[PDB]
Write a protein that binds this ligand. Structure first.
Ligand SMILES: Cc1cc2nc3c(=O)[nH]c(=O)nc-3n(C[C@H](O)[C@H](O)[C@H](O)COP(=O)(O)OP(=O)(O)OC[C@H]3O[C@@H](n4cnc5c(N)ncnc54)[C@H](O)[C@@H]3O)c2cc1C
Ligand SMILES: NC(=O)c1ccc[n+]([C@@H]2O[C@H](COP(=O)([O-])OP(=O)(O)OC[C@H]3O[C@@H](n4cnc5c(N)ncnc54)[C@H](OP(=O)(O)O)[C@@H]3O)[C@@H](O)[C@H]2O)c1
Ligand SMILES: Cc1cc2nc3c(=O)[nH]c(=O)nc-3n(C[C@H](O)[C@H](O)[C@H](O)COP(=O)(O)O)c2cc1C
Ligand SMILES: [Ca+2]
Length: 607
């Protein structure tokens, strides 16, 4: 059906929840809200806006008690997710009267970014401008705090508002219904079983372009080398062969990789569950009208699903804990789990401490709640899909057109729970032996780019792994110089803990400076003295030259830690401009923010 409104009429739904999602979180929130509808006598469905035409919103009044909800995540520079781009474009050009339309929006964002929840804010503002009626205030979910708690708090007030305005009431039947039913495929041909590939069956074996998120290219690991000294931490440089993939990229772009869960974790889950992981099965949607026939590719074995399709490392969200409680035979244990779904009080404190702060993954929860023995098929229905991880490409395609490089630090730490957590993708990449080893990947374009004019100077700030895109930038600027082009100054402000422990690309950067490609190599060693010495300290010391370059039209790039470094660096640039630019601090802020709008102050930061 082309019209979501007609689809709603045909299937008896009065609430439709659209999701703007890239890594599945918004989709899960939409699904959870859609299922809630029944608890109020209403009927809902979640939907991918890209599959429909949002202009049809003006027809919702044809359905009694119609309600439309939007769970939208914000991405690069405050833009919409790819699947919500058409909707965003429609909202920008339309002036249709949406009187009679009733809506609510929950935005997914992260305060460490420059444009916090920009998409949710825009959708909410626009719908009202068009004449639609807001049923409940805009939800501002913040992944830098705890997005789950923001969502459940908003969700509760949301339904109360729905009850008040539409005159409905809760049912109270927390029975919780399964969304999928299990079918064991005892006699299936081996060749018809998914073995970890995404999308089409056999797409990993039979690789045909175009390669993207739904059809990743299996790139061979040609290089995987340790960049630092000591068993302390592990920093590594990988080179992935993309020959014959037709994949294109530019320095500044991101490479996404689909990891495989640790087999030791998968094996232990199978044992504690008392399940034969090699059983091949299928989970089928009880809603025969939904386009989402299964929770992940199937038929497939439990081992395969728990290895390639499901997230078993991230601390579970509250709905998973609430639904599992019914399987805890011990009163105390079943009570602990049930409470964690509370938006406040003891229950919330326990969730944030026992699950989140303690970083307990599903196996840890099953282990620390020994009476919890849920059927493996229901667990597979509850666990979120395993998502790709993004890395800043550390190579220039002008120099390495057939290889995509990665600079990454392995995540590994002890939990207050006495366990050793290992980063999903980094522990997996670390184990990829060069020269056989394949990494399913794809490229995600970014707006982080070297200046159009080679003469334009660049100021690069990237401590730690934030140096990644800049290795590529320098390779390219060096290449331009080798092509006989006039290249402006190229400055790198890099930082590490100690010059003899975690100085990434020491030799390469030194050679680029000796070659003349890297005009300046400014490095801050943070722990080689009593007080911290960071990149911003070096920027402040270089205020005169930096102001000259900025005033001249230089481009600034900041990559790495978004939580504190990005903010501290930005604050230092404000000070440089306020001090030497002949203007007040507030004017300096406006000045730097304006550079961002002009593409002369770019960010590639993360957490
Ligand atoms: C646009 C973008 C670009 C990126 N570029 C790079 C890059 O170039 N290089 C790079 O190394 N990474 C980069 N990252 C981070 C990268 O995508 C992954 O998040 C990171 O490699 C960790 O993934 P993982 O699967 O190994 O860890 P996961 O299994 O996902 O675990 C990570 C989580 O573990 C927890 N954690 C980590 N250390 C501790 C600790 N000491 N105590 C308690 N909890 C802890 C945190 O909750 C953290 O969120 C980028 C991210 C984005 C969004
Ligand atoms: O990659 P990775 O995680 O492995 O990097 P990382 O080692 O955690 O950090 C990279 C560098 O950034 C420094 N740093 C920490 N907080 C900072 C801030 N607010 N502003 C500027 N620099 C900061 C670190 O110093 P410290 O770790 O000594 O704080 C370190 O020298
Ligand atoms: C490359 C990237 C860029 C992001 N940019 C922003 C941003 O500009 N503003 C913001 O508020 N949040 C930003 N976020 C955070 C997401 O909006 C948040 O993680 C959300 O939960 C993701 O939802 P999803 O899993 O449904 O895609 C960004 C995340 C990534 C991975
Ligand atoms: Ca210097």
């Amino acid at each position: 059906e082309s019209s979501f409104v007609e689809k709603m009429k045909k299937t008896g739904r009065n609430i439709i929840v659209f999701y703007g999602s890239q890594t599945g979180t918004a989709e899960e929130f939409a699904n959870r809200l859609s299922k809630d509808a029944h608890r109020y006598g209403m009927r809902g469905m979640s939907a991918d806006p890209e599959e429909y035409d949002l202009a049809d919103l003006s027809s919702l009044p044809e359905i009694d008690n119609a309600l439309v909800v939007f769970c939208m995540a914000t991405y690069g520079e405050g833009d919409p997710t790819d699947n919500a781009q058409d909707f965003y474009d429609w909202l920008q050009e339309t002036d249709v009267d949406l009187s009679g339309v009733k809506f609510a929006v929950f935005g997914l964002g992260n305060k460490t970014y420059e444009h916090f929840n920009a998409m949710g804010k825009y959708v909410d503002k626009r719908l009202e401008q068009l004449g639609a009626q807001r049923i409940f205030e805009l939800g501002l979910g913040d992944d830098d705090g705890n997005l789950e708690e923001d969502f459940i708090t908003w969700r509760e007030q949301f339904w109360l508002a729905v009850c008040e305005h539409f005159g409905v009431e809760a049912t109270g039947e927390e029975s919780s219904i399964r969304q999928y039913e299990l079918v064991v495929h005892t006699d299936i041909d081996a060749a018809k079983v998914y073995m970890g590939e995404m999308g089409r069956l056999k797409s990993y074996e039979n690789q045909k372009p175009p390669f993207d998120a739904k059809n990743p290219f299996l790139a061979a690991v040609t290089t995987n080398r340790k960049l630092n000294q000591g068993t302390e931490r592990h920093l590594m440089h990988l080179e992935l062969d993309i020959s014959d993939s037709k994949i294109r990229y530019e320095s500044g772009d991101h490479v996404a990789v689909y990891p495989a869960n640790d087999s030791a974790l998968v094996n232990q889950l199978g044992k504690i569950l008392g399940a034969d992981l090699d059983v091949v099965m299928s989970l089928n949607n009880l809603d025969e009208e939904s386009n989402k026939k299964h929770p992940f590719p199937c038929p497939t074995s439990y081992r395969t699903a728990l290895t390639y399709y499901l997230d078993i490392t991230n601390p579970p969200r509250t709905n998973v804990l609430y639904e599992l409680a019914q399987y805890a035979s011990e009163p105390s244990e079943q009570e602990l789990l049930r409470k964690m779904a509370s938006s406040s009080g003891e229950g919330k404190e326990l969730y944030l401490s026992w699950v989140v702060e303690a970083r307990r993954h599903i196996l840890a929860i099953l282990q620390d709640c020994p009476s919890l023995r849920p059927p493996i098929d229901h667990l597979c229905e509850l666990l979120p899909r395993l998502q790709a991880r993004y890395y800043s490409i550390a190579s220039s395609s002008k120099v390495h057109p057939n290889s995509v490089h990665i600079c990454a630090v392995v995540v590994e730490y002890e939990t207050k729970a006495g366990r050793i957590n290992k980063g999903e993708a980094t522990n997996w990449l670390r184990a990829k032996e060069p020269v056989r080893a394949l990494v399913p990947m794809f490229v995600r374009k970014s707006q982080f780019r070297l200046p159009f004019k080679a003469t334009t100077p660049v100021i690069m700030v990237g401590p730690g792994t934030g140096v990644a895109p800049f290795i590529g930038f320098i390779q390219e600027r060096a290449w331009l110089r080798q092509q006989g082009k006039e290249v402006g100054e190229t400055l790198l402000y890099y930082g590490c803990r100690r010059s003899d422990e975690d100085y990434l690309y020491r030799e390469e950067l030194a050679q680029f400076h000796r070659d003349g490609a890297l005009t300046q190599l400014n490095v801050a060693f943070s722990r080689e003295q009593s007080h911290k010495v960071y990149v911003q300290h070096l920027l402040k010391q270089d205020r005169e030259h930096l102001w000259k370059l900025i005033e001249g039209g230089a481009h600034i790039y900041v990559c790495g830690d978004a939580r504190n470094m990005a903010r501290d660096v930005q604050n230092t640039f404000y000070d440089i401009v306020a001090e030497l630019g002949a203007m007040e601090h507030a004017q300096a802020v406006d000045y730097i923010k304006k550079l961002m709008t002009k593409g002369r102050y770019s960010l590639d930061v993360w957490s």
